[PDB]
């Protein structure tokens, strides 16, 4: 907690804190006195990633020690293995210079553990180990990237593991594994070039499903993953001419159905507007016969939701800014603005200004 409070202020004591953490991890046996011993080291490494203190930490020796511990037939508890995998993944991110000779070895370890935990027909999975492996992979792929245009096998099996992680095949109660999978997908979606361009339908469906979840961190992770996926797919469909006839019309139909739907809160409308922008921007497929359509739709919905509906709008005020941002994003696109919808707009902005103290 103290390192979280004063991050960079602990300049001289970092080496001693790391030494004490390593000594507690080595000499002690209880996991309750061992999980914090690795959490503090992870916080140290995340706080001093760019600082020059990464030379006295001996990242190479630490990685060697933890890898030798991994190669032990004696099994450690599940909760500490998660932190071990997370730390091993972080070791490649904060100091990749000393990890060029070990990233290829660590990727095989991560892939084997993920396959053992997600392709086991004789034993139940271990969700903490899964979340740890996912976070370690998301932290290791930051520098030692593996794209489809570099090596297809690894970049495809990683994508399949991410799919199976974010796949709601069996609904659970803890969301650590799907949250880590969504964060991994959001961080490095630019590597799975041909992967996301084949199962894009199921990807979009599951991302829309997770973006409406009741959780907050899971919602943010799903939103970031959906934004990255939409950006990548829009780039791929706007760069070449063979992706238009299927993907362009599919995504345009999806966005139009999301927009013209009557039961769709501000989240889906904003997502549809952002996707339509990111797609029709570079693709140069904008047609005023539908931009004006979605503009009139948004204006009528805002009018029937905020202006005419003069009732107990407990949540409407807390979502009016998103409606205004979407309306502005749409209005900036079309060039022939209907003059009949200018009052509704001016009065709408006036009433939004009036609701300022309620925020």
């Amino acid at each position: 907690i103290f390192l979280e409070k004063m991050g960079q202020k602990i300049a001289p004591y970092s080496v001693e804190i790391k030494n004490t953490c390593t000594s507690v991890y080595t000499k002690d046996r209880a996991a309750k006195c061992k999980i914090p011993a690795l959490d503090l080291l992870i916080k140290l490494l995340q706080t001093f990633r760019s600082s020059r203190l990464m030379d006295e930490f001996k990242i190479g020796e630490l990685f060697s020690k933890f890898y030798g511990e991994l190669a032990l037939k004696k099994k450690i508890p599940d909760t500490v293995l998660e932190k071990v995998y997370e730390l091993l993944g972080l070791l490649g991110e904060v100091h990749p210079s000393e990890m060029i000779n070990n990233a290829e070895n660590l990727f095989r370890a991560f892939l084997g553990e993920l396959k053992t935990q997600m392709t086991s027909a004789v034993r139940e999975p271990k969700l903490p180990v899964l979340a740890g492996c996912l976070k370690g992979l998301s932290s290791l792929l930051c520098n030692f990237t593996k794209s489809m245009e570099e090596d297809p096998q690894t970049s495809r099996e990683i994508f399949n593991f991410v799919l199976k992680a974010i796949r709601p095949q069996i609904d659970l109660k803890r969301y650590a594994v799907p949250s880590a999978g969504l964060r991994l997908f959001a961080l490095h979606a630019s590597q799975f070039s041909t992967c996301l361009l084949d199962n894009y339908v199921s990807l979009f469906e599951v991302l829309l499903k997770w973006c409406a979840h009741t959780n907050v961190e899971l919602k943010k992770a799903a939103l970031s993953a959906l934004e990255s996926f939409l950006k990548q797919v829009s780039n791929m469909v706007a760069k070449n001419a063979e992706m238009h006839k299927n993907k362009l019309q599919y995504f345009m139909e999806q966005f139009y159905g999301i927009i013209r739907n009557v039961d769709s809160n501000n989240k889906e409308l904003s997502i549809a507007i952002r996707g339509y922008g990111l797609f029709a921007g570079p693709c140069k497929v904008i047609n005023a016969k539908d931009v004006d359509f979605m503009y009139v739709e948004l204006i009528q919905r805002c009018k029937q939701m905020f202006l005419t509906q003069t009732d107990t709008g407990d949540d409407r005020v807390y979502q009016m800014p998103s409606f205004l941002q979407s309306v502005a994003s749409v209005l900036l696109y079309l060039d022939t603005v209907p003059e009949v919808y200018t009052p509704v707009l001016e009065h709408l902005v006036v009433m939004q200004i009036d609701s300022f103290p309620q925020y």
Partner: protein, 507 residues
């Protein structure tokens, strides 16, 4: 009660003048006898149950060592697991010069208050950081009326003993040899919890329980714990929860511990597999399983060898019933387990269990089942032989009620017997053998034999821990004692030999 509960025992030995000077014919002083008894209990408990708590407290001394600084009360050892060093510390006072060592270290012959002694005992009982199943204080003294010429201290001690007994502390009396005579009816009749109903008269010697405590019984005791909580499946719908218990388990010596010869401390063993050529470490995900048959080489993953040996889910699938008349006694494969209902996973299992037990007992039928103890385990066929409880020895349960899980061997477990001819014997020979068998018959008890190797290992460990160079040799109780069997049969052996053997024959 609880599985995690352990036992606690506090040795309370007096240190008055009568404890050191009672040698009528110079055989054993009451203090030396108490030290011998305490050492015997320590030795017998350090192997049987090494997780119990023992404490030795001396009262009536001159010095004092307490947590509340009471007077004339010295706590030598607190409630902890019995070790070898405490045995030596008690040995410091065992010998005759041990009495002088005691009187120079702690002193003797002083006044005391029996209330403060019980208070220190309760304080020691209240410092335990584990659950205690039984709390017992054995008082080693030779004072039939300790608080003489004073009634206030006697009433205070009686009130404190009542408080301790209300707390749940067993308080028995181990009276030693009193010269004039030890009568517990004076004072200790109202102190102890239960009276043995035979000490209405007076005693002139040691107590009858000291000889019981001096017999060092070395046998590791294990608490009751089910091997597995399976589910007897009378059908895909009718399922009841039963507990599998083992009543006969092979006793094994404790496994050794790798040590550092210099500091005599345990070392940490870390097995590790790596490539011999490159030198890089190998994880289980980077390893396959092979099995070479001739020229071929079958390659299988790690998790596939478990698929090879899995058929169904763990539990007891109920097959039909079979009479006991067709269950051969020579069809033994594994030691028989014990089935008993749990009434904790499913509600209503005990009633159906008792019904099945009664119906199988009155019909002497054995419910055949398919035994799968753990996940990914090949199934075995077992017959749930019904067992009726037997209440003997003034209503003491010697056999629990339930079913007897008996393993049945398969076709390949039975081996082939070579062909031989049945040569029989004459009625005279069979009658002679019957007579010589009736001459040597006896009564068998299941607990009449001991494992000689295990007992010898215990004796050797004691000799190496206590640093005594005279290791006790445990007499082999499994020997037939041929030096006494021939004296009973008499001259039947040579007659039977001449009857069934040729004139000249080399056996």
């Amino acid at each position: 009660y609880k599985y995690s509960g352990r036992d606690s025992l506090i040795f309370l030995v007096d240190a008055s003048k009568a404890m050191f000077e009672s040698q009528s014919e110079d055989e054993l002083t009451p203090f030396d006898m108490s030290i011998q008894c305490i050492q015997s209990v320590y030795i017998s408990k350090i192997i049987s149950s090494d997780r119990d708590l023992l404490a030795v407290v001396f009262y009536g001394t001159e010095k004092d060592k307490n947590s509340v600084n009471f007077k004339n009360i010295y706590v030598l050892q607190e409630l902890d697991n019995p070790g070898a060093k405490r045995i030596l510390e008690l040995d410091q006072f065992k010998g005759q010069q041990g009495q002088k060592r005691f009187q120079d270290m702690m002193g003797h012959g002083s006044d005391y208050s029996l209330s403060e002694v019980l208070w220190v005992c309760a304080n020691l009982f209240s410092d335990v950081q584990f659950k205690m199943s039984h709390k017992r204080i054995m008082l080693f003294t030779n004072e039939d009326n300790p608080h003489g010429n004073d009634s206030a201290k006697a009433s205070r001690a009686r009130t404190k003993a009542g408080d301790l007994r209300d707390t749940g502390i067993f308080l028995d009396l181990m009276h030693l040899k009193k010269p004039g005579g030890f009568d517990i009816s004076l004072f200790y009749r109202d102190i102890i919890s239960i009276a043995e109903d035979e000490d209405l008269r007076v005693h002139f010697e040691e107590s009858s329980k000291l000889e019981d405590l001096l017999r060092k019984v070395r046998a590791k005791e294990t608490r009751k714990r089910a091997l597995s909580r399976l589910k007897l499946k009378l059908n895909k719908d009718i399922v009841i929860s039963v507990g599998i218990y083992n009543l006969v388990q092979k006793a094994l010596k404790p496994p050794p511990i790798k040590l550092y010869r210099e500091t005599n401390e345990p070392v940490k063993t870390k097995t590790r597999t790596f490539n011999t050529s490159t030198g890089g470490l190998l994880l289980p995900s980077d390893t396959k399983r092979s099995q070479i048959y001739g020229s071929r080489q079958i390659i299988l993953e790690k998790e596939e060898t478990e698929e090879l040996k899995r058929f169904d889910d763990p539990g007891l699938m109920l097959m039909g019933f079979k009479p006991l008349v067709l269950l051969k006694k020579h069809h033994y494969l594994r030691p028989s387990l014990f089935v008993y209902p749990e009434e904790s996973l499913v509600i209503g299992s005990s009633t159906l269990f008792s019904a099945l037990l009664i119906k199988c007992l009155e019909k002497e039928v054995a419910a055949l089942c398919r035994y799968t103890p753990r996940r990914n385990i090949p199934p075995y066929f077992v017959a749930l032989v019904p067992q009726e409880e037997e209440l003997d020895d003034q209503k003491i349960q010697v056999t629990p009620p339930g079913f007897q899980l008996v393993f049945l061997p398969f076709a390949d477990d039975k081996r082939k017997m070579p062909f031989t001819e049945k040569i029989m014997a004459t009625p005279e020979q069979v009658g002679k053998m019957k007579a010589i068998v009736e001459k040597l018959r006896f009564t068998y008890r299941s607990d009449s034999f001991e494992n000689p190797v295990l007992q010898q290992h215990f004796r050797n460990l004691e000799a190496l821990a206590l640093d005594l160079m005279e290791p006790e040799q445990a007499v082999d109780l499994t020997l037939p004692k041929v030096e006494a069997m021939n004296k009973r049969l008499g001259s039947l052996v040579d007659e039977f030999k001449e009857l069934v053997y040729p004139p000249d024959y080399n056996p």
